[PDB]
Symmetry: D2
């Protein structure tokens, strides 16, 4: 319905938000390719290709190899944990690489391609951590603030070329990566109890917003950072 005739690439489509967005896009009629470290995770759900988003050459090769790209979703990311003194140089470099530099490359590859094919939509999954300080997320927040600034910079520069660039900034969403950090879904029951809404977000809730941004009806949004966080940053 809403994405028929659109060609989409979703980076880190193997699980969680990335996967939910790939599945939602396909449901709305998009031709979707899910790039991920573990394409077997997508066996029989969405077309998939192996991609390590840390690999610049592979990111440029994949995007430049596509015939047409209408929507690019950057869902790749890692959540280092720790306050200022717990954080290490290795945390810093790993997180800035995957959370921000990877997206830099993907946009470098995709935006000219898109501009030269008329237009497009780029959707970066950031985090509410870009705006809201919480304990033990020193490195993570810095990477995500960088990502939002980059989203807006790209949006301004390519607006005259028909390419929209936006970020979605989720709060705490129940994902496989969250479960392994918090120890299963009843590990999650504790923190879900602390939320205002007494529950955690769903990947589907984030995917539906991405569908909007990818759609023809999302075409007047650019340079925006959409917070979906259950009121946690209030």
């Amino acid at each position: 319905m809403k994405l028929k005739g659109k060609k989409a690439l979703v980076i880190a489509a193997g699980q969680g938000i990335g996967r939910a967005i790939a599945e939602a896009f396909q449901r709305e009629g998009a031709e979707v390719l899910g790039a991920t470290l573990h394409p077997e995770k997508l066996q029989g759900v969405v077309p998939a290709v192996r991609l390590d988003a840390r690999d610049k050459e592979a990111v440029f090769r994949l995007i430049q190899g596509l015939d047409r790209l209408d929507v690019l979703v950057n869902a790749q990311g890692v959540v280092p944990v720790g306050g200022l003194l717990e954080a290490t140089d290795q945390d810093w470099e790993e997180a800035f690489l995957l959370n921000a530099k990877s997206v830099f490359w993907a946009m470098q590859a995709a935006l000219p391609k898109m501009a030269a094919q008329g237009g497009g939509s780029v959707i970066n999954i950031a985090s509410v951590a870009a705006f809201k300080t919480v304990p033990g997320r020193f490195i993570y927040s810095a990477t995500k603030a960088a990502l939002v600034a980059m989203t807006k910079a790209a949006a301004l520069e390519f607006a005259p070329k028909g390419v929209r660039v936006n970020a979605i900034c989720p709060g705490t969403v129940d994902t496989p990566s969250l479960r392994e950090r918090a120890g299963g879904e009843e590990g999650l029951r504790a923190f879900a109890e602390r939320q205002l809404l007494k529950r955690l977000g769903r990947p589907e809730e984030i995917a539906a917003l991405a569908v909007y941004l990818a759609s023809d009806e999302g075409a007047f949004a650019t340079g925006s950072a959409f917070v979906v966080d259950g009121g946690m940053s209030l």
Copy 2:
């Protein structure tokens, strides 16, 4: 099919964004009640009722008279024109009454009722003027900043009761009221030429986002202000 179960009330559903939202809500399966000063405009389009949002008793009577209310959309508003010295006390009183005070009343009426029924979704149509300073919008900008603050306050307070409260913040959208502002359709191209995208927003672009926020998929968004402004605040 995103709203098939839901009862929605749209205040100022007669034209522009409010009407686009009402029509879109209708298309997505919702039972819509359109309140407006001119109910004839919704004849054969959406069920309607006559309402002057400046009248506190009328606002409370309408909302408290409803059996069940799943979605409330506050699309009422006036756009006074002028810088600081051109602005009058009459502009101030009229704009704060309609743009802000009437929403205060609508929310006072609706949020307890929604709280009791287990949840719901309130959507305030604010403006990017709440965040982005532009010339000749002194009063308008103050009212819309007030409105976003109220949106967040209500969101925090009723999040435990499962009632979401969010704002959409449009940029320059082609509406009957903008056209009357611009002195006619002839005055629109000047506005469009100032836009990064070289075109004005479409009310449908705002409506699609309201559908997301009214839907079950929007249930993790609360206290957010969604900017859809064609990049103008970059």
Copy 3:
């Protein structure tokens, strides 16, 4: 030394933050006039004039009657308390009148005057409530968000004239009116203990920032909102 040869008007200079600003201004060499409902509180401290900031005519008459005005400080304000359903129309009208409309009037009177003399500085005392949602401040936060938007709108309009307009956004500051709504000392003390810094802000901490903004060294700040809130909005 820092405000030598400056003429300053402080509205609501009779107590709290307003008084600290007037005293600090005078210490730094400015000629100061403290306008207040209660001029008796300033005798033998700063030159004083009776002024009810709710009275539009009186506000214009005082400001237009001054020979030269280099600095205007709007420190007037009231803090109603309550959530959405506790808040009243009385609260709304009173708070919007004093916190926002009176500043509208004062800037209408002052800014063209300052613009004609080639520069000046307007300092509005807003609140971190303009940005940060806290329980029980529904009306207050709305009025202060309005005030910050007005600050920026005026700043943009009069920047080419060399007149700066800025807001200081304090957190919880120890003032007679805070103690009037807390108790006097005992808690009061309870609230202080619970704060991040385990103390309330001092009026002098806001006043020193006001000195910067009023001074020639503050001439490159305009349209800014300076948060001084003991970290409470983090």
Copy 4:
């Protein structure tokens, strides 16, 4: 009189905003040490030491070697130019190292020390580019947004220990680096609302407030001083 008896370290104190801050601190009574790649620029005027802020070991050694430290200013930085496609990975690495990672290190060294010795004030010189998008500043904007996020994170974590952490976010300030980037200045001043560039002294006076006892209620703040350019 605003900083009597305070001991301050200013990193990249050799020119521009860092230099103005070091001189202002001294006029306000502080004992100042200016650290810089070019201490010869400060000599006779401000006590100075050579420091390359890119060298992690050097940063920790200087800071942990100080007797006492009441105020730390991170004024180090670089402004790469270019849009998305112009920007290079080398631009990225060099700007994130100096603009952000070196501040990470300086705070890791200084904050625990301050916490154990009666608190203090850390002032990071960011940029209004952290908030306001302008053409040709893709990398720069990313680094300064990271820096503001870091400022707020550190401020929350160390508020309970008497340490304040704040950022000043300048607009376009007349500095030797700007002049080299750009007479030249004129064309860039014409397209400013105030029809002129910021002065380093205008930033420095705000740093004095933040460093002072009267600035102690500010923490986690990002103070914009940009001539209205982000309006």
